[PDB]
Write a protein that binds this ligand. Sequence first.
Ligand SMILES: [Co+2]
Length: 430
Amino acid sequence: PIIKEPIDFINKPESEAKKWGKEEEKRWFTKLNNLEEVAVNQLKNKEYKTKIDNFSTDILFSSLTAIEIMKEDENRNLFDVERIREALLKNTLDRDAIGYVNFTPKELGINFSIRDVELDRDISDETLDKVRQQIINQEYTKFSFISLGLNDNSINESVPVIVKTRVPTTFDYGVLNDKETVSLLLNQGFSIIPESAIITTIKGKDYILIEGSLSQELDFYNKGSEAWGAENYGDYISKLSHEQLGALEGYLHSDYKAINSYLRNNRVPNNDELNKKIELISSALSVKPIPQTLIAYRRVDGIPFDLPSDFSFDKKENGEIIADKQKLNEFIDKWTGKEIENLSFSSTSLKSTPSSFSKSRFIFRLRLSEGAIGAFIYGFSGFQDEQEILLNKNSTFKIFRITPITSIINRVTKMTQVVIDAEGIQNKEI
Ligand SMILES: [Co+2]
């Protein structure tokens, strides 16, 4: 398309942003049906917006079964989320847009106070260094829809972070104009990669100004992909020797209980036959290393975190069941930045929420690097839709962000769970 200077209102009068914002919203709103307009317009309401952003996160980590239950039930939040997505589809950018994406500290895996606790005004250099260490060159996905605030009135003073980025031409968008804020609305699932962070002061208040690239991770959430495995692992079996195939098939079908436990026991007492199988399974998994960086999922219970298996992030309060904020906060503060050791092979799926694991509260969202020793289990008898990626033994999960959610289990059941963002790391013999 024809080249145009980007949308940029940062160094322009407010009235200019307001005029542009009003026409554009009107223009979008005219493209919308009545139900899409109410769903979209209500996002100017902060309680509604929070709720909808929350729900739009929750449904990515609910089983495909729960989604259907909700469709049947005519779930108004799921419907509103679906109407918002559809509304966004009717509008595509003509040019780049420059502005501020609405990431909070928590969404950049920051749990400590950025600003001084008392005045909520100053950021120390030590704090700056600590945030740089957490965020620089790290990729953080916004699960919900994303706002791009178009001028300095969009800066929320209570938020100690300003994330400035560029949205490329051809992306879907809507524009919302309310009460001195002009913003774009954008799709779920974009990431920011922070590239620099300095301290800026506007109106006596300190912010961490972050310049980031907008990107996107290869992530299938609860849908998984039937194409990714065929594309990348369609000829996998044919690349294995007989002994690699046999050893792997054995692990998948019969040996994994024994092998996992032998490995979890630091190989004591020594078992030469198990040693031989393990050697051959590891050997198989490096025949076709992970070909590109992607997200795979492993739901687990409390055990790897030294917690009861039946540990709940929920509590009885006034009759109903609500989130235990205290438990969430303490779990996040203890585990952000920690490494989870996996002595045995680790099972993983392209699907975030296989329904048999609906009640597993700790949802590892694993960045597997290109080159990672593992394989998508394609064409094996019995694995007919698990969409499994088996990772090599000694795969460490280094946690960079922990995001509480309200997973939907069935018509009558919800559950506070945690999305645990980690990188798969292999300090790796074999
Ligand atoms: Co703060």
